[PDB]
């Protein structure tokens, strides 16, 4: 009840009870700021739990052994963990830690790692080294959380104190059990109580910036810090998603069993496919009904043209024909003592026989119940376990099938009986078609591809300088300036004047290490190659790009669920056309010099021979190299620059790679390691992986398959499908589509035999295909069943964050950004919208205050950041959806939605002004907004959230020689420099400063210098300046909004009739969205999902496909469109395009094209800084932008909404102005008609032009 | 003229939308499970 007493107004504010104001928000934020952890645990103890919330806790979590019997010292004086269960028992042991703690000062009941053991390990003791390695590794495991966990627990308590929430659409309260039924939260309380014991302190551990402190007690172990985060994640997911209690109890049982085992991370890795394999892989054993989408994707295939044609009922014969997954599931449940959970899951799964919403929600809950944490282990062990495996080639290429060496490459004669002939042919044709194809010789293309890898990020520069100084060649050093000295930009500046002959030695340097953790998967090591080593591998990635662009059917999709090929999964998961999931295990170590690289280098080498003689490639001169090709005689065979590139890359690939490992968690554990695995983190990795996958699948389907099969039906199936029609590969993973015939779906036995054939075929050249045939589809970690997406909640943890090194965390605005990212991730995953909004506001308030004086962010800043608001100004609660556009458009949308009530509310209490405003009328909006801090929050939200360590003082002439070095590196070909100088000349002649900052190639070194300086630690003065900036912004008073927002508010709209449905209301398209989730369900049904990949659709809008790194294509196109709208001569556009580096004829033609053509709304929108929000990109927004937003009013022309024939670009801005309002409001998306513009179309266009003449 | 956003205002659009969906000829006769005689 203390939560109620200390937070009364805040719950009523954020639960739709009363109005949502700023003073209550700030008081609640202050109370969050001053709230001790022990008080949090007391309030936790005040919870009156019930039964159904209690699950027995084994007594063996607390009583654990020590760490000495788990580690040892091998030869070469290295520290590593001995294994007890196979070769994967190399994770953190669950042993006790108490005997390694010395009490910290200023508080007795907490301690950290003792400095005595640290010193005794530093000077060379063995047991001390083991103890400190264990302590540091446990510290790293415990340090995998965004913020102190008590903040999240208290925010959940505050949010859930409100109880059930009313639903405006469903017209009833939501039936979700309260906190008294929260099993994980009760487990958290019990564990904390048992660990704390008689000691007054109750927190098992406290998480600081750098390092954490352990509360010493005999019951404390190393498995507690991940367990607590796991339970809190489960509790938050239960509260914000309506998870049923049984599945959450099963998940908590699994988590406790994992904690009680020998190793938490190892056990949770061994049991990571319990829920997905018992539930997702076993439903619909017997069907009687349901609806599935009747997708059909057109014969143009590389463009991914998908069409949706209604929904068809499910027949009984569309049951689960895949082989049963019972034996291995039962065996796994019996092995690890989880038989009860597996039996419960299997019994519960069989009770769902109809493809309604409930089964999909049950699947979503089951997949969400898995444990999502970032697994961690010592780098010297992941290096020793990942980079020592080698491929197993059972039928290698015969020795007689090669020829004499062309330098270090032997061409493979086409008379071979091996399967590598087809791979060699495909790569040879790809290389030839590249070399003949002419865009690879324009200097701009070479400059772009040379600047691809030049990035403000580490690239192992120390090894580069050591290797290059090993030949007594000296490179310049820069001292006194604040740029980072361990980045690839520094290497590029150092390698400016040097020719290729001197820098060719550094190609064989030893790469440094890298590491990053991942959810429910072993951490991946990454080797960044130095700048010349990126350079030397350009033809490989280029011909791989050609293969992946023309020869095969594949995609190179983006990171988020919005930018992905969702339609393909929906099509491949429909019942008539079942699909097969093909995955390659450990593809990094797969390809080596024995088979794959050996074929590929020769194919590339003689692919380019007869197309490019001379004409040196980027920074690599052509050279001479002999060959013993034919019988005995040897020639000199002059080669091009690309072939010298290939020779150097071939020696690098033939010898192997040297991998320096100098970790920090284990002292005295530095060494080197030679490995044969293909490097990860290189430019060419994913492209060649996908190309090889496609080529090998194609050759299997063509030649190898029929040569090793007997049955007629399987042969008929294999002759029917090809990779150009049904096979989509991206990197390691892949997906194959089997389409349905006239007689239903293809027989399962033929598919099983074909999969056995694939498994046999893959082992010939050292591949182990991980093939799953379960009736569902998996691709890029997306799960589909019967044409319905399923978001994996556990893969996106709420409190988790991966950290490899022991670096301290970023300041408070960074955690603000992280909370906003958490909210957006919750949006994409489809949670319970009301509860999720309330909890997001709770976290918002919790993390909104920080001392230095105190600094606070007024709620309105967070609203500007995109978080929707519940109930303000006395309006109806739960009135705005989260499809609100972020940014200015978003403010306009909600303000224009609620304006006629805002004015009434303002006037009703002491805000009256005689002056009349066209937007707000006679209400003193200025004083009200200044008092409400709305201006203050709106302006403060725009300030940068990172210290302005860029621009720090630097001694002169040193920055000058630095910038000169980058300028020389960027532009080695004189003709491109001539183009840039011309572009500047006609820009001075014609541009005349119409646009303030036109992008150009000369400013790339400045941007690179700023970026390289940015990646550095910020001094205390930079943080002080940041806090002073925030304080000054808060204290200041603002007269009015930004120009864009004031211009937007001049537009009025009207909403008459709702759209007709675009999707059947009985068709489950995605999990989590259903009648229980009113807003997303209605939004998707009224608008419709996007049935086209967003990547290509967004790509077709850009004028220029790609530009040099350090410049933005959006910036270039925005400058071009500003120079069109603000009247300017064509010559100005020609000068701008020349400054970008385009050739004079092409620049002239493109400027002439741009002058007169019209372009779709997206590009025109960019002119005023507007883009489609990342939230909308999961829906079919294009049709709404085209048709369902009409600029002509419903009652004809009003003579006031008269857009002139000039400035016709206003239509796109009006389209987003209407669409933001159409999408912000809850319920059905409604057709929206333009009503009135106050100042007139020409006046509003003049306002936009006078803003364009800025920036 | 000055139309705000209201719960009843959302409800009327919801009713119009659902009526428009229900008045679809295919939806009017579509069924997910067969009756006792269509199976025969």
């Amino acid at each position: 009840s203390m939560i109620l007493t200390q937070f009364g107004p805040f719950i009523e504010s954020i639960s739709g009870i009363t109005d949502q104001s700023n003073d209550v928000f700030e008081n609640a934020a202050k109370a969050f700021s001053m709230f001790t952890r022990s008080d949090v645990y007391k309030a936790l103890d005040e919870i009156p739990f019930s039964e159904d919330a209690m699950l027995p806790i084994p007594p063996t979590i607390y009583t654990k052994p020590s760490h000495d019997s788990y580690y040892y010292i091998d030869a070469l004086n290295r520290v590593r963990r001995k294994t007890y269960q196979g070769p994967d028992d190399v994770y953190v042991p669950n042993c006790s830690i108490v005997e390694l703690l010395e009490p910290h000062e200023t508080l007795t009941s907490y301690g950290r790692l003792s400095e005595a053991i640290e010193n005794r390990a530093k000077d060379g003791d063995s047991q001390a080294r083991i103890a400190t390695t264990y302590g540091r590794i446990a510290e790293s495991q415990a340090r995998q959380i965004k913020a102190p966990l008590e903040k999240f627990v208290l925010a959940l308590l505050v949010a859930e104190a409100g109880g059930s929430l009313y639903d405006p659409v469903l017209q009833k309260y939501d039936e979700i059990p309260g906190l008294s039924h929260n099993c994980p939260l009760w487990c958290f309380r019990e564990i904390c109580r048992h660990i704390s014991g008689p000691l007054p302190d109750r927190a098992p551990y406290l998480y600081l910036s750098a390092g954490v402190f352990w509360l010493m007690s005999p019951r404390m172990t190393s498995a507690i810090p991940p367990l607590l985060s796991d339970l809190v994640n489960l509790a938050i997911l239960q509260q914000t998603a309506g998870l049923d209690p049984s599945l959450v109890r099963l998940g908590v049982q699994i988590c406790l069993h994992a904690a009680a085992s020998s190793s938490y991370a190892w056990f949770i890795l061994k049991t990571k496919s319990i829920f997905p394999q018992n539930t997702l892989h076993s439903m619909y054993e017997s069907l009687e009904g349901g609806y599935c989408p009747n997708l059909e994707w057109l014969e143009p295939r590389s463009d991914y043209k998908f069409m949706y044609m209604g929904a068809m009922p499910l027949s009984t014969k569309y049951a689960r024909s895949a082989p049963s997954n019972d034996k291995k599931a039962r065996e796994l449940g019996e092995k690890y003592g989880l038989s009860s959970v597996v039996s419960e899951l299997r019994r519960r799964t069989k009770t769902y026989s109809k493809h309604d919403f409930t089964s999909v929600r049950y699947i979503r809950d089951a997949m969400a119940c898995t444990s999502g944490i970032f697994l961690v282990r010592t780098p010297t062990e992941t290096v020793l376990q990942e980079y020592t495996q080698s491929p197993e080639i059972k039928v290698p290429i015969p020795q007689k099938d090669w020829t004499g060496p062309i330098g270090e490459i032997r061409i493979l004669k086409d008379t071979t009986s091996s399967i590598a002939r087809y791979l060699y042919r495909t790569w040879y044709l790809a290389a030839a078609r590249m070399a003949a194809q002419p865009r690879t010789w324009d200097p701009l293309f070479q400059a772009i591809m040379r600047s691809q890898y030049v990035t403000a990020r580490g690239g192992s520069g120390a090894t580069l300088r050591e290797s290059l100084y090993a030949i007594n060649v000296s490179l310049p050093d820069f001292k006194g300036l604040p740029v980072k000295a361990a980045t690839k930009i520094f290497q590029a500046a150092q390698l400016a004047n040097l020719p290729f002959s001197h820098t060719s030695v550094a190609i064989l340097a030893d790469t440094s290490m890298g590491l990053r953790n991942q959810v429910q998967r072993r951490p991946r090591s990454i080797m960044p190659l130095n700048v010349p080593q990126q350079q030397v591998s350009a033809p490989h990635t280029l011909t791989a790009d050609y293969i992946n662009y023309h020869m095969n059917l594949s995609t190179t999709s983006g990171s988020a669920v919005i930018e992905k090929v969702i339609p393909l999964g929906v099509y491949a998961s429909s019942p008539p056309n079942q699909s097969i999931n093909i995955d390659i295990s450990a593809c990094d170590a797969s390809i080596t010099w024995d088979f794959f690289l050996s074929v590929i280098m020769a194919a590339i080498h003689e692919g380019v021979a007869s197309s490019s003689i001379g004409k040196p490639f980027m920074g690599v001169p052509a050279s001479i190299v002999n060959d013993e090709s034919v019988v005995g005689v040897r020639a000199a065979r002059p080669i091009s620059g690309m072939q010298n590139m290939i020779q150097h890359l071939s020696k690098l690939y033939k010898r192997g790679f040297s991998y320096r490992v100098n970790d920090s968690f284990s002292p005295g554990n530095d060494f080197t390691h030679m490995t044969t695995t293909f490097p990860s983190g290189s430019t060419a990795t994913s492209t060649e992986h996908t190309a090889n996958n496609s080529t090998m699948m194609e050759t299997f389907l063509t030649v190898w398959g029929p040569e090793h099969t007997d049955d007629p039906d399987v042969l008929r199936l294999m002759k029917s499908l090809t990779i150009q029609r049904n096979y989509v590969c991206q990197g390691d993973d892949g997906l194959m589509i089997i389409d349905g015939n006239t007689a239903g779906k293809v027989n399962s036995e033929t598919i099983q035999k074909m999969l056995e054939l694939i498994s046999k075929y893959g082992e010939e050249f050292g591949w182990k295909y991980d093939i799953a045939y379960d009736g569902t589809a998996e691709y890029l970690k997306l799960y589909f069943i019967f044409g319905c997406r399923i978001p994996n909640l556990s893969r996106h943890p709420i409190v988790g964050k991966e950290r490899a090194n022991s670096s301290a965390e970023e300041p408070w605005p960074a955690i603000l950004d992280q909370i906003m990212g958490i909210f957006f991730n919750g949006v994409h995953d489809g949670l319970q919208w009301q509860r999720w909004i309330r909890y997001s506001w709770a976290l918002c308030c919790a993390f909104s205050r920080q001392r230095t004086g105190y600094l606070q962010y007024p709620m309105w800043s967070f609203v500007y950041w995109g978080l929707p608001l519940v109930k303000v100004f006395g309006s109806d609660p739960w009135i705005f959806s989260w499809y609100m556009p972020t940014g200015d458009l978003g403010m306009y949308s909600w303000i224009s939605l609620i304006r006629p009530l805002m004015t009434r509310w303002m006037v009703a209490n002491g805000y009256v002004t005689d002056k009349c405003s066209p937007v707000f009328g006679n209400a003193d909006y200025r004083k009200c907004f200044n008092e409400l801090k709305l201006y203050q929050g709106y302006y403060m939200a725009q300030l940068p959230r990172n210290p302005k360590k860029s621009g720090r003082a630097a001694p002169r002439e040193v920055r000058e020689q630095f910038t000169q070095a980058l300028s020389d590196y960027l532009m080695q070909n004189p003709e491109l420099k001539s183009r840039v100088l011309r572009g500047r000349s006609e820009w001075e002649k014609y541009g005349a400063g119409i646009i303030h900052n036109p992008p150009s190639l000369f400013d790339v070194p400045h941007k690179w210098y700023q970026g390289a300086q940015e990646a550095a630690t910020a001094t205390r003065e930079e943080l002080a300046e940041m806090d002073e900036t925030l304080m000054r912004a808060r204290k200041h008073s603002y007269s009015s909004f930004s120009k864009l927002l004031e211009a937007y508010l001049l537009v009025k709209w009207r909403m008459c009739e709702a759209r007709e449905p675009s999707v059947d209301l009985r068709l489950p398209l995605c999990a989590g969205i259903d009648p229980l989730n009113s807003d997303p369900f209605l939004k998707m049904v009224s608008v419709g999902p996007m049935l086209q990949s967003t990547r290509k659709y967004f790509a077709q809008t850009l004028f220029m496909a790609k530009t040099v790194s350090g410049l933005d294509v959006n910036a270039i196109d925005s400058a071009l469109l500003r120079l069109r709208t603000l009247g300017a001569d064509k010559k100005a556009l020609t000068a701008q395009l020349l400054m970008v580096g385009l050739q004079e004829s092409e620049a002239d033609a493109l400027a002439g094209k741009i002058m007169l053509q019209d372009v779709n709304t997206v590009q025109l929108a960019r002119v005023v800084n507007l883009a489609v929000p990342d939230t909308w990109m999961s829906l079919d927004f294009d049709t709404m932008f085209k048709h369902h937003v009409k600029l002509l009013p419903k009652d004809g022309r009003h003579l006031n909404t008269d857009i002139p024939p000039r400035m016709g670009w206003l239509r796109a801005i009006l389209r987003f102005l209407g669409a933001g309002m159409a999408m912000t409001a809850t319920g059905v998306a409604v057709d929206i008609y333009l009503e009135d513009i106050h100042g007139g179309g020409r006046s509003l266009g003049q306002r936009f032009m006078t803003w364009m003449r800025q920036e | 003229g000055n139309m705000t956003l209201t719960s009843s205002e959302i409800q009327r659009h919801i009713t119009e939308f659902i009526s428009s969906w229900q008045n679809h000829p295919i939806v009017q006769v579509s069924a997910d499970v067969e009756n006792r005689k269509t199976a025969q």
């Binding site: 017209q171 109806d876 | 209201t6 719960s7 009843s8 409800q11």
Partner: peptide, 14 residues
Amino acid sequence: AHVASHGLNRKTAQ
């Protein structure tokens, strides 16, 4: 209105 939404001379006289 919200609750409704929830629920959903002498001579002349002579």
